[PDB]
Symmetry: D2
Subunit: 478 residues, 4 copies
C-alpha cells in the first residue's frame, strides 16, 4: 500500500498506491533518462538531475497545496478524489519532455519539422493517455474512487488547459486548475519544485519560500469563480518569486556556454536524424523528429540518443558523431558577445534565420585581414520575461486582507514599490563564431560590435576592449 520515498528536496514523502502504480510504468520511468537542465550539466557539474525526480516533487507539492486549502476551508468540498487527481496531474505534468528537456521542444523540433506546432505539454497529454491505456490504470483508478471518464479529462486539462471552458470540473472548483500549471499568473507548484531542486544541484541558494506561500494561501470569489488568493502583505515575496526565476535563467538555464552546447547537440541530432531508427507501434520505424507522432516510439527516445550517436561506428553518422566529439574535447563554438535591442524594437521569431547574414554583411571602417561568411556566425535570440510576455503577472493575482479574509482585492505596481522593474520582458542576442582560431575570433568581434552600432543595439559590455577602433564611431555610446 502507501509507500514512503526519500527526496533530498522534500524529505520523506508518501505516495498513494495509485500513484505508485502510475510511477512504475515504462512511460514514467523513462524520465529517469532525461536531464532537467539539458546541456546545463556540461557547465554546472552538479546538475545531473533528471525529470523523474522533479516529476515526483511536483506531484508531492500539488498534494500539499490542495490538501492545505482543504483543511483551512472545508466549505470548498475538496474530496480525496480531487486530491489524487491533482497529484496525478502534477506527477505526470512533464511526461512529454524530449531528450535534453527544453532543447527538444525549443530548438530541435522547430528546426527539424517547421510545419508542426509541438510543445512538451501536448506530449505530456499524449504520453499520459498512452501510459493509462498500455498499463491498465483505469480499473485501478476506479478501485480508489476516481471516475476515469471525468478525471482523466480533468488531469489532462490541468496540464495543457482547456463561458466556463473546462469539462473536467465545475466553476466552484476552478482553483484546482491553478495548482500544477497556473495559466492566470504562473504561480504554480511546478516552479516551486524546480526552484528548490535546480538550486540544490546547481550550487545556487534559492531566495523563495513555497511553504510560507501555502500558509498564506486562500480561496475567495473573484468574478463569480473561486480562485487562489495570496495575502496582501505577501505581494513583495511574489515579485521576488519572478525575480528569482529570471535570475536562475540568467545564471544557469540560459548560460552562454550551456546554450552553445544545446545548439551543438541539436545540430548533431539534425545530422543524425535521417539515419537513426526507433521502433514504435506495430513495428513501424520512426526517426528522432517523428517519434513524437507515436508514443510507443517516443517512450524509447531519451538522452541515450546522445551516447548512441557518440559511440557509433556507422559512416552515415560520422558528421553527427564529429560534432559530439568536439563537445568532449571542448572545441566549442566561441562566444563573441551579447547585446539587446533599444527602445521598443522586438525581434520577430521569423527573422532569426536572417541574422547571421546581417553580422557578416556589416562593413567595419578598417580593412580586414580575414573575411568571414554568414554560415560562420550563430545568432541566438533569447526572451527573458516574467512568464507572461510583456505583462506583469502580479497584476493577475488576487489578494486578501487580514481584516476580511474572504474579500479579494487587487494590488497595482504603484501600491508596492518604486524599485520594481519598469518592463517585464526583454531580449538577449548572443553571437558566437564557429571558427575558433585567434585571427577569426578578432574579426568576428569587429563584425559583431559594428553590427550592434549598425542596428542601434546596446553597446557590448566588453566592447571598448574587444573592438576599440569601432566603439568611438557611435555618438550614442559616448
Amino acid at each position: 500500500t502507501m509507500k514512503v520515498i526519500n527526496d533530498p528536496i522534500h524529505g520523506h514523502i508518501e505516495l498513494h498506491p495509485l500513484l505508485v502504480r502510475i510511477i512504475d510504468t515504462p512511460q514514467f520511468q523513462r524520465l529517469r533518462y532525461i536531464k532537467q537542465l539539458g546541456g546545463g550539466y556540461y557547465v554546472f557539474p552538479g546538475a545531473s538531475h533528471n525529470r523523474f525526480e522533479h516529476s515526483l516533487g511536483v506531484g508531492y507539492l500539488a498534494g500539499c497545496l490542495v490538501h492545505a486549502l482543504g483543511e483551512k476551508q472545508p466549505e470548498l468540498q475538496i474530496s480525496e478524489r480531487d486530491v489524487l487527481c491533482v497529484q496525478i496531474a502534477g506527477l505526470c505534468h512533464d511526461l512529454g519532455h524530449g531528450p535534453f528537456s527544453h532543447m527538444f521542444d525549443g530548438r530541435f523540433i522547430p528546426l527539424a519539422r517547421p510545419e508542426v506546432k509541438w510543445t512538451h505539454e501536448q506530449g505530456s497529454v499524449m504520453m499520459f493517455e498512452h501510459l493509462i491505456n498500455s498499463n491498465g490504470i483505469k480499473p485501478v483508478m476506479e478501485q480508489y474512487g476516481l471516475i476515469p471518464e471525468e478525471d482523466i479529462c480533468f488531469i489532462k486539462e490541468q496540464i495543457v488547459g482547456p463561458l466556463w471552458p473546462y469539462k473536467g470540473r465545475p466553476e466552484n472548483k476552478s482553483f484546482l486548475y491553478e495548482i500544477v500549471s497556473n495559466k492566470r499568473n504562473g504561480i504554480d507548484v511546478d516552479k516551486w519544485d524546480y526552484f528548490a531542486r535546480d538550486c540544490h544541484h546547481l550550487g545556487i541558494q534559492n531566495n523563495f519560500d513555497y511553504k510560507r506561500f501555502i500558509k498564506f494561501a486562500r480561496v475567495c470569489e473573484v468574478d463569480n469563480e473561486l480562485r487562489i488568493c495570496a495575502r496582501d502583505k505577501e505581494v513583495g515575496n511574489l515579485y521576488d518569486m519572478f525575480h528569482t526565476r529570471n535570475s536562475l535563467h540568467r545564471r544557469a538555464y540560459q548560460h552562454k556556454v550551456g546554450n552553445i552546447i544545446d545548439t551543438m547537440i541539436t545540430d548533431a541530432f539534425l545530422k543524425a536524424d535521417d539515419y537513426i531508427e526507433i521502433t514504435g507501434a506495430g513495428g513501424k520505424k520512426y526517426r528522432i523528429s517523428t517519434a513524437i507522432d507515436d508514443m510507443e516510439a517516443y517512450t524509447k527516445l531519451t538522452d541515450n540518443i546522445f551516447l548512441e550517436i557518440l559511440y557509433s561506428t556507422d559512416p552515415k553518422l560520422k558528421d553527427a558523431r564529429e560534432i559530439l566529439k568536439q563537445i568532449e574535447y571542448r572545441n566549442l563554438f566561441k562566444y563573441v558577445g551579447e547585446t539587446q535591442p533599444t527602445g521598443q524594437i522586438k525581434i520577430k521569431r521569423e527573422d532569426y534565420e536572417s541574422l547571421p547574414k546581417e553580422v557578416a554583411s556589416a562593413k567595419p571602417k578598417v580593412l580586414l585581414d580575414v573575411k568571414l561568411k554568414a554560415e560562420d556566425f550563430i545568432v541566438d535570440v533569447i526572451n527573458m520575461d516574467y512568464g507572461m510576455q510583456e505583462k506583469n503577472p502580479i497584476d493577475h493575482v488576487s489578494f486578501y486582507c487580514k481584516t476580511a479574509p474572504n474579500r479579494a482585492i487587487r494590488i497595482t505596481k504603484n501600491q508596492v514599490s518604486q524599485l520594481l522593474p519598469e518592463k517585464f520582458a526583454e531580449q538577449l542576442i548572443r553571437v558566437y563564431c564557429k571558427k575558433v582560431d585567434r585571427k577569426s575570433l578578432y574579426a568576428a568581434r569587429q563584425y559583431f560590435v559594428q553590427w550592434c552600432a549598425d542596428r542601434n543595439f546596446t553597446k557590448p559590455q566588453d566592447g571598448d576592449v574587444i573592438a576599440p577602433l569601432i566603439t568611438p564611431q557611435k555618438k550614442e555610446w559616448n
Copy 2:
C-alpha cells in the same frame, strides 16, 4: 599561538595571536551581549545572534579577500602586516554599536540628544582606541611587525573613512584597494555585507541569494584614475545588482518588519523614560546616563542589551514608567499597526518633518461618522528610507569592471548595458502608521484618519485600503 574557532557560517577559521589578544578584552567581549537585529528577535525567534560572532566573521572575510587579492596579484605587494591590519579593522568595525544595535544610533540617541550627530562607526573608532590603550596592545602589535602610529590610523580610517588629493594618512594611493574591503565608501560592496547576509539568513529562516566566494574569485585590482581599486568581472555585473536586491529584500522582510520596528520604538521609549534615573560609572568614577555613555568609553563598555532587563527587573519607583512599557512588550500589548503608504511622483519627506506627521494624521477630517476623536499623541508615524546604500544613486555606476581579454584594463558598465528589468529608481520611502490605543473602536477610527490622510497628501492607496476604510477610498478619483 594561533587559535581555531568554529563558526556556523564560515566553518573553522584561524585567529592570529594578535587577533586573539584583541578579542579577549572587555571592550570586544561586550559584543556578546548586544543582539544583531535588535528587536527582530521578538519577531524572528531564530535571531538570537549577537555582534560578537558577526564581528569575528567580518574579520575573517576581510582576511580572505585581501589574502586572495595577494595570491592572484603579487605585484600589489600586500604584506602580512597589511593583512593583519585589514583583519583587525574587520574584527573591530562594529565595536561601537549600542544596546539593540541599530535602535541605539538610529532611534534612541537622535531622540534623547538631538544636538549630537553620533554614529555607531564613530563609536567603533573611539572604542578601538580605548581597547588598545586599556589592554596594552601596542607592544603586541609591534611584536608581530605592525607600526602602531601608522597602522592604528589605517585601521580607524578603514572603519569611518578619512579622519581630516589623496585624503588618507594611513596608507598611500598604491594601496587604496585596502580601504574598499571592510567598509566600501565608493559603492558599498564590502565584506561586512557578505557576513551579515549569510549570518542573518541562517538565523532568520530566509535563504540568501548571494555568493561572496564567487565574487572573491572574480575580484581583481586595476588602475582607475591614477589609483588602484577592486574591480569585478564584466559578466558578474548581474550578480552585483542582485546583491543590492538581496539587501533591500532583507530590509523589507526582516530588518524593517512592521512589528520588529514597533518593538524597537517601544524599547527606545522605555529607555527615554529611564534615562534620567540610570547611572553608569565611567572613567574616574564620573556618573553617566544612558544617552551620555557614548561620551566616555569606559562607561559605554558597560552599556549593552542588559539595560533592557535591568529596567524590567528593577523595583525603583522612578523607573516604574519605563518598566511598565517593557512589561507591555512581555504581555504583547504592542502598539497596533494601521497601515503602510508611500509618496508619489518624486516627493521626498524631509527628516525635519517627521516630528510633525502624527499631528497631520489626527488633523484629517474623514467624511465618516466616528464615536471617538483621536489626538496626535495617539499616533506613531515611522518613515523608513529604502535604498541601494547610496541615497538616490545606483551603486553599480560606481563599480569598475574588467574583461577576460584584458584583465588590467578597467571599464564602466551603465544600466542600459545590463537589463531592462532592473529598478527604475534606487531609493524610496515607506510610511507606517501605528495607533497607541489598542481597543476595537479606536483602531477603526485610526484606520479612517490614516486612509484619509493618504488621500489628503496624494499618497499611494494602502493595499488593504478598500477593506479597512471602505467609505473613504471612493472619495479619491485617482484611486478608481
Copy 3:
C-alpha cells in the same frame, strides 16, 4: 487568533491561540534570556540560542507526532483536546531551567544547597502552575475545550512523570499511554525534546546532525504491548535508533561536555556561589530571595536569568568583588588550565558521594619526580562526567517496541544480537577531567605530574598525552607498556 511564526529549524509553524496566550506571559518569555548550552557560547560562538526558541520547537514537534499518529490510526481516538495538551506540555517542558541552563540544576544548586533534591523538570511544573494562575489561563483552556482539573494534571505528568503493578497516571487512562511517550519518554528516551535540540544545537554549533526525526514519525505506530497502547517503531529502523543515541553521545563529547565549556561553567558557578549571600531578588509579597533560594518562590524565579552574570560583572558593591573578579577572569580568558582526561577501568563506577574527596587525592599522590612547587588540594578541580544512552547502564533499545511490515499491529522486541556486532559493548562510562587553578608554567608542569601519577595510583587509563606531559612517570606503570 492563529499565529504563524518562522523558526529556522522547523520553518513556518502555526500556534493555536491558547498556545499564543501561554507564550505571551512573563514566565515563558523569561526563556528568551537563558542560553541553551550555558557556557558553550563561550567556546562555540554560534551557540547564542536560548531556551525560548527550543521550547517553541518542542511544542511544535510534540504536535506533529501526536497529530500524525492520529491521521494514520483513527481508532486511537486522539482528540484536538489531546493534541493541545501535548503541545502545551512540549511548549512548557523547560519552563524551569535556571541561569545557564544545566549549570544551574547540575553544578550550582547542588553546591549551594546540598540538602535539596532539585531538578529543572520540577521547576517546570511549579513555573507552569505559576504561569497558569497568574495569567488567567484556566478560562481560556475551557474556551477551547480543555478540562483544567484533568488536563493540567496530564500536562504536569508529561513533564515530570507520575505525581504520586497498576496504572500510575491520573491525567489520562491506559488506552492513551502513548501520549506520555511524546514530550518526555520515561520508557526509552526517544522523545521530541531530543529531536528539536539535535537539529537546533547542530544548526547553531556548526556540526551537521546525523538523525532524521521526520522519518521516525513516518514509521511510528501505536500497538498493544502488555495491555497498554505504546509507540512502536518499524523493525528495520532499529539501526537508526542506535544511531540516535550515538548522535546524542557524540554531541555530548563534542560540545555539551567540551573541556573548556565545562570549565567556564564551573567558573560561573563559582562566581554565583561567592555572590549568593549578597544578591537580593524580589519575590511574592516583596519577600527577598537569594539566587539559591529563588527556586522556592516562582515569582522570584521569574526574574532569575542569565542577567545575573552581567549584574555581577557590572556591579560596584565591595561585597561582590570576589565574585566579580572571577567573571572578569573569564573576559580576559585566564581560565583554569586543563591538565588531562582519564577513565576508570574494569567495572569500577565512582560514587557521586566521593566527588568532594578527589582533589585531596590528586595532591596526595607522591610522583617520583623532582618538583620545585608543592600544590595543595584546593588548587585542583576534578570533574566527573557520566556519558550514557540516557538510562544509566541499560540499553534503551531493549526498552523499544517494534512492528513488522507483514503485521503492523503486532509488537515485538529486538535484542542487541539481532542487529549488529559493531554496536557498543557497554552503554555508560565516566570521564574524569582534572584542571589546575594555578595558571603559570611551573605549576602546570607539577599538576601534570600529580595527575598522571594519580592515574597510575588508582589504576585508571593512561592519559592520551601521558607520555609527553609526564614522560618520567609513565614507565612506572607495567600495565601501560
Copy 4:
C-alpha cells in the same frame, strides 16, 4: 594563452582548476565518467542519487589539493613543491577513471561472475585508463610545460592510485611518504576520496553527514614515525576519527547496501550476463569486444558506461530478449522478493568460496511441518555482505598516528581503552540477505519457512521479523527464547 578555470560544485563551491587539470578533464576518457552513476542501482531507491563519477572525481581532485596545500603552509620544512601539488591533484582527479557501468556493481558483482579466472579491480582500471588518457591526448608535453617530469610523476600518480608498482615506491622518496596518504590511504583509510563522497552522497541521498573534513585538515600535521614522514592527527580528534568510520558504516547500512538497491544491482548484473554474448563494442584497431572483455582494451572500455543498460532495454534483437526482459521487470518493479536478513554468531566468518553453495543450503532445509510448495535452489538468492572499518577485522585507528599540543612534532599512538568504553567491540561483520525469485503469495510464505529454518540450522541470529513470518519455526530454537 591557456588559463585557470573556475567551476561551481554544489558540495565544494567555486573551485579552481589549473590548466593542466582542465586538459586532462577535457578528454573522452575522463568525460566518460559523466555517464557512470556513483551509487549504481541506488538511484532506483534514492531518487536524489542521480550523481555520477565525473563530479566526484573533480571533488577528490580538489580536496587532494586542499590537504597537500595546507600541509605545506603549516610546515615549510617538508618542501612541498607546486609540482607535488599538481601531481596529487591529478591522482585525485583520475583515481576513479576505471569504474565500470554502475560503479561497484561492475567490479563487485558482474566481472567476478562473467570471468572468474581474472582478478580485476576498479583501481587497476584507473591506472590503465590513465595511461590510455595520457598517450591518446598528448598530455606528456603539457605536463612538461608546467614543470612536471613525466617519467617520475606518471609513476607517482599511478602509485597514489593502486599502491606500489625497504622503501617500495619509485615515484617519490621516503621524505615525502605523506603524499601517498592523501588520495588513497593504504595505512588506515583516512583519505580525501572518503571525504568527498561522504559529503556528496549525503547531499544527493537525503541524509545529513556527521563528519567535518575541514576540521581534520586544520588539525593535520606531518611527523616522523619509524624513519618515515606521515600524516598525524591531533590527540583530542581521535573521537572524530572513530566517528568517521561509524559514518561510513552508517552510509553503507542505510544506502549503499540497501536491500532493494542491491537486488536491483543483482538484476542488472543478471541482465548483463545474459546480454554479454550478443553485444559488441569497438576497440583498438576495430577489434570487437564483449562487455566482460572491454576491460582488456581501454579504447573499448572508454565506450562502456551506464548506456549499456538502455542499449539492452531499447534493443529489438531476439538474442537479447532474455536480458531485455529482466530490465523490463525493473521498470514495472517486479523485483525479486526480500525474505529476510541474518548474521553469523560467535566468530564464524563465511568464506567467499562458499557463496555459490548457500542457495542449495536454504532449499535443503527441512522445516518440521511438511511443505505444500517445494522450492528448488535456483529460486533463492543469498547475498553475503561484509561490513567493516575498511581493514577487515582490524581497527584502523590502531594504525593512525597522533600528536599533542605540548609537542607537535612527536608522534604517538592511542589505543581503544584510552578513548571510550562505548566504541565497537569488533570491526567487521557479515550480513546475509535472502531473496526469492518467485513472487507469488504461496512461494513467498514457503521461502520464509525455508529461510528461518536455515537460520536455526546454522545457528545464525534470529531474523528481526522472525516470530511473525515463521511463527511455527521460532520456538524450535532454545537459543532464541
